[PDB]
Structure formats: structure tokens, C-alpha cells
From a paper:
A unique portal vertex exists at a 12th I5 vertex through which the genome is translocated during assembly. Here, portal proteins assemble into a dodecameric basket-like structure that is thought to seed the assembly of scaffolding proteins, in turn driving the formation of spherical procapsids composed of MCP, SCP, and triplexes.
To improve the resolution of the portal baskets, we carried out separate sub-particle reconstructions and refined them while imposing C12 symmetry, leading to portal basket structures at resolutions of 3.6, 3.5, and 3.7 Å for the A-, B-, and C-capsids, respectively. Additionally, an “anchoring” segment of the scaffold protein is resolved interacting with the portal baskets of A- and B-capsids but not D- and C-capsids. This density is weaker in A-capsids, but still conspicuous, whereas it is completely absent in C-capsids, D-capsids, and mature virions. Based on our model, P452 interacts with the essential residues W127 and L131 (both adjacent to W90) from the first portal monomer, whereas Y451 forms a hydrophobic interface with Y83 and Y608 from the second portal monomer. Our A-capsid portal reconstructions still contain scaffolding hook densities, although with weaker density than in B-capsids, suggesting low occupancy, but even residual presence of the scaffolding protein suggests that these capsids were likely never fully packaged with genome, as full genome content in the capsid lumen should displace the portal-bound scaffold.
Author numbering:
A (entry chain d), B (entry chain e): 24 to 27, 29 to 310, 494 to 623
The structure:
Amino acid sequence: DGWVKVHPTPGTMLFREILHGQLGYTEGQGVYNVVRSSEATTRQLQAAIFHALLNATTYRDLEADWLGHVAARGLQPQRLVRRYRNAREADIAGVAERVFDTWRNTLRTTLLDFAHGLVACFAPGGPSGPSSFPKYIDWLTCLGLVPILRKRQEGGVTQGLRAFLKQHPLTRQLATVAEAAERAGPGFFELALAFDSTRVADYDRVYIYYNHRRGDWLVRDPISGQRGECLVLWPPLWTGDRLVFDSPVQRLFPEIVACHSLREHAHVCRLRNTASVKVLLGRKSDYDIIDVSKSMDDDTYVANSFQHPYIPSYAQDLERLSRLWEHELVRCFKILCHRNNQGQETSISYSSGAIAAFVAPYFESVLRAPRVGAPITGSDVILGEEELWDAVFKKTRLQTYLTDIAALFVADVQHA
Amino acid sequence: DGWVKVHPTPGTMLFREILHGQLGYTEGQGVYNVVRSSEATTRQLQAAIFHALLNATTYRDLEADWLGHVAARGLQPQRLVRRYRNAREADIAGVAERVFDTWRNTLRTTLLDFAHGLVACFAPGGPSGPSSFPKYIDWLTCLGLVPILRKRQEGGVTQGLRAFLKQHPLTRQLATVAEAAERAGPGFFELALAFDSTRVADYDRVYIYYNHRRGDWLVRDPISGQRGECLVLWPPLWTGDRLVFDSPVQRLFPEIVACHSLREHAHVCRLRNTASVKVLLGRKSDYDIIDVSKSMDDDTYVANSFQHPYIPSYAQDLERLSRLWEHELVRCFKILCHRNNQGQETSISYSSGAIAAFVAPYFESVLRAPRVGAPITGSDVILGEEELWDAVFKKTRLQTYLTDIAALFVADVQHA
């Protein structure tokens, strides 16, 4: 009843195998390896965790803990000035600044350690297991669909968070960490459940049906019998007894098949020339390969014979196809390449537009994540994780409180 | 009865299948992938939302909030000067300046967070669902027409806006944000209704009819029976025996068809040369392939034979066609190319004229949106969301109010 089977057809499997280089290979197709890297999602996740944790802190606990530290040292400004008993303002100011700098540095190191402790829990899930990003990207590169299956249940990531959080000494040792972690905990649990709940269907098991009249998508898991929820990023076109997707492989397909056929023909012609001497026979009127044409002669005579050992040339086509693959992928997925003065490709990375267009829908639709704050810029992908923590620390809330309390402490030290 | 059937004709479908590389592909055609992108539209939406939110604020509530912050700290000028009891006006001025700087930075980050909160509601609707932008662009690239369908109803975007606004706490926390959100809300709801109401018809379901004498357009949805409206951007020409559009595919159409025919002929000629030795027979006067001319000789003799194994070459034509595609699209859609010292195509973007010519009609005619403020320039498309927010933030009302308040506060502190 107007239903069509879309995915399990042989053409789709041929697309997928074309991606594995089952008919030819090129230098251009090698760029794809970077398009599947999971680095950007992990960087975004690190940025999200850092933003969530640092945003929780507040001025009250920071001031309370600084006061507790100065009381523990017994280094209150009154006592310090009473000990020194001289009015050299520069020396006392420098001493106070260095004390506060020591405390500040140690606090930043502790916070960084805890933050890295948090991230390590989520990282393995992104590339592998439920919600694997490379599978998503190659799903898009093949069809533009992304059949997704969902169930709600606690699993690995939630258990990891539960084990990591509920015993960490750092929360007990500092009020800042205690309040920040207790406030940020619920969101992390929501995100962990989001990571655990959703899995992307496997390319060799799922079934997809499409119906033109309603434009309805039915997706089916044949093993468990579980119905899924289809997603379409680049809508296809229906043209009768057909269905034409707009994925890159479909656009490139009519070209690579012709190139492959040319290569097969050139292979066939080469074997023909292996024998270097040929003989032609006929009927009288009345290494080495010989052509017995006697069987057709009757009241006929041989008029002429010709030789032309043709061998098709195909290197030009391979160069053209390599450049075509490279340009197609680079322009389609918004890849950005850095270059030397004349040398090419020092590194390859997602552009800002690339992360915005591809990573964002992953988190929002595929994962159904709570929130990720402002997205990271393309330049922050190249940064290391430590540098990412540093950079997010520079602009975010905590540094303002630190500078304010430091300046006030120095002023009160001098004026006390 | 004097009407013409336009769209579902075979040539119209052949145009779109050409767009999917159903006859050849090239490096030039790959540039089209950047034309479809929805980046500029989302940048425009972000700019519009940021303009709307900041403009709503007012000075009196901001001054009241600053005074409330100072009172909560208890750090009023009189108390502070009485506390320090020295005439070093520069030091106290710096202390006050740093206090205000802390408050200003906190306000900046808070408003940025809320603004990003608002934007997320609209963004997903642009690229997919009703009023999808790439569908509009490919409609234009194929014909220059854009059939539209309309119903007034409240859908996903309005529900998201309703849920987000009534729950948000910043309205309670800050009076300025409360008033700004209350003022900007109605415009957001009208814009959300604009997003939800309109729909761009699918290229494989809609019918289009044209009447030369009257000069009016009829667009029909056959499955629903609904009647739509047609937007004609580059009007066609009725030459009596046809209807000729002026879309880029129409202009490039003869060239690509000629090149495809040349490639097919060159393919056919190649298979003809696979056999290297040929034999030609004749009739008595009373790997290998045999040409039997027995049955056609009588009262005749053979006089001469010629061999010339021609093989057309087509690489030059493919190069010409790639360059033609690239230049045509670049000049038609006002795309802008960035380049290294000598290297080409570091990135591709939309020129200011491109957004003015294409994005503006989308919003105003296709979407019937209320207002978008002044348009962004082509440079701001490259910038990230943070940078765009900063750029709009710097040059608007809030900064004048903040700097006035800071100047007055510091001056009064030091004069007291």
C-alpha cells in the first residue's frame, strides 16, 4: 500500500562499501578520516562541564574560605603590621600580594584537578557505545538520515558519576567545591542519563520504510522488534519508482562508477597484448596466438586485415577524481585547513561553522542534552584541554571575585 | 482553456536531478554546497534578538539596581571614605572603579546567558521544518519561483517561547530584565507565529499553473487540496511555444547536456576498440571481430577499405564546464572568497550585498516577519556568537547608561 523499502536495498549497501574503498581508493578520500574524528564533541563537552561548574560558585564561600585561610595562618593585617612596625608600604603590599597569589594558585590547581576528574567519566561514551558520534557522521554521509532508538534506564555513565561524586574529599575540604558540586550535580545526572539512554542504530541491522503520500518515516529494529524514531537532516526526493538522496556519496556516485569501469576495461586490454605474435588463417580456393577463422569461409575470400593495439589511459581520471573527492568533502563539511608559507596542511580541523552546524544538532536532537551554554569557537578545538580550562577561567565569573577580594585585601592591609 | 501546466513537466524534474549530479559532477558545482547553508539567517536572527532585548532596557531601573547592589554591600561612598580616612583620592577612585567593573562584568555575563537562552528557541526552525531556508534557495536556483502555503496556528516555537519565558528566574532577580523581557515578549511571540504559520511547498508534491493572457499564478497542493501563493523573483518569458525561465540551471543547461552527450559518445567509441585484429571478407568473383559482407555483393567488386580508430577526448570540456559553474554561481549569488598570500579559498562567505538581496526578502516577504532592525554586514557572518553579542552590546543604550553611571559614581566618591 504505497510503502517502499528504502535502506536494506543493495544500492545503499553499495554506498556504504564504497565508503570502505571496496571499489577503488584515492588520496582525496583520505580526508574523510578527519571528518569522523570525535575531538570536537569532547571539546564541547569539556567546555560545558567547565562552564557548569565554575558558574555555580559564589562570592560568599570564596570570601569565607579566604578569611579561614588567613585566620589559620594567623596572618591578619593588624598582626602583620604590628610585627613589622615600619611604614614601608611597598614591602607589605608585595608580601600580601604574594600570599594571596599562593592561595589563588593552589585553589586554581585544586579546582582544575576536580574538573578533570569530572570530565573523565563522560569522555568514553562520546566516541563509542550508545550515541557514538562517528556512526552518526557516516550515517549522514551515506543518506542524511539518522535512525535513532530510545529507552529510559540507568546505566554506565550514571553509575560512574554516582561512584565519583559521593565520596570525593575535595567537596568536604572546601566550601566552594561543596556548594558548586551540590548545585551542579543534578544537571550532570540529567546529562549522564541523556548519554546512557539513546543509541544510534547499526547500519547492517536496521530497516527503514518510506511512504510518499504522507511523507512518513517508519524505522524498525528487526532483532528486538523495537520501533525507532527517524531523523532527516537533508530531505530526499521522490521521482516515481526511485528515491534520490542528496548525500555526498550520491552526488559523487555516477562518477566513481565510470572511473572504475574504465579501470576494469584498461585491465582487460592489457592482458590481451601479452602475446606478441599473432597469426591469421583462412581457407584455400578449391605467447603466440592463432586465430582460426576457417569455420566461416565458404565461397568467400579474405579482403583485408588490420591491427591496432589500443590501451586506455586512466591516470588523468584518477587525479580528477581525487581532487573532486577532496573539494567535495572540504566544502560540504566546512573543514578548515592551515598552511605553511608555501607548504600545505599543517593541520586539519573543524571550522566554527562546522561545529555550530553539526555538533549542535547532535547534542540537541540526537542526545536531547539539557544545555551546553554558549558553543566553543573553532580555534578552541586546536587548544589542549588544559588551555581550554585556563581560557574559560579567564573570562568567567570566578576571576572577578578573586580580583575584587585581592584588591580589597591589599587596600585594607595598607589602611589598617 | 488557455492555461499552461508548468512545474511537473519532465524538464523541470530534469533540472533538479541535474542539481543532484544525475548527469556528471564537477569541482565547480561543489561551491553550491556553501550557497545552501543557513549560517547567515541564524546570524541575522541572533542579531535581531540581541537588538530587541538590549533596546528594551531603561536607565532608571538600572540605576536602582546599581544602588541596590551598593546598599547590599554596604559600601556607600560616605562609609568607605569615613573608613579609610585619607586624602589619596586616586586609590579610592580606583577601588570604586574596580567595584563597578566587577558589577558590570557580572551584568554582562548574566545578560549574555539570558540572550543565548532566548535564541535557542528559534534557531532549529530555520534549517528544517516549516520555512526551511535551503529549500527556498534550491527553489530559486531551479526556477526563480517559490510556492508558499499558509495557515494561522500556534505550534512548536510558540510553545517553546511560552515555556521558556514564564519559568525563567532572571525576571524575578532583576527588575531591568523583568521590564525588558515584558516589553520584548510580544514581538517574540509575533515572530514565533510568523515562523510557525508559513510553509514552503515540497518540490515533488506541488502543482503550478500559468496563464499568459492574465499574467497571474496558481499554485495547488494536490494531496491536501490547499491553495497557495507564489513569489516570483526573476520573472520568466513566454515565447509562445514554451516557457523559459532565467534561473542559473536554465542558462547552464545546454552546456552540461552537450558535455554529457560527448562523454557518452566517447564511452561508446572506447568499447569499439577492444578487439585488436579485424578481418574483412568478400564474395568470390564466381579479441578478433569478423565483418561479413557476403550478402550485399552482386554485380560488384571491392575497391578499397580504410581504417581510422577515432576516440573523442573530453577533459578540456570538463575543465571548461567546472570553471563555468564556479564563476556562474559566484557572480550570481554574490558569494565572496577569502584567500591566503597566494593560496586560494581559505574560506567562503556571503557578501553584504548577498545577504541584503537574499536574506532580507526571505524575512520580509516569505516569512512576513515583523521587523529585523538594521541588517548585519557581510563581515559579521564570520564572527562567532560571542563576538556578535559583544559588537551589538558595545554600541547601544546600555553602554551609554553604564558609563554615565560609572563616571558619576566615581566623581561623586572622590568629590565627597
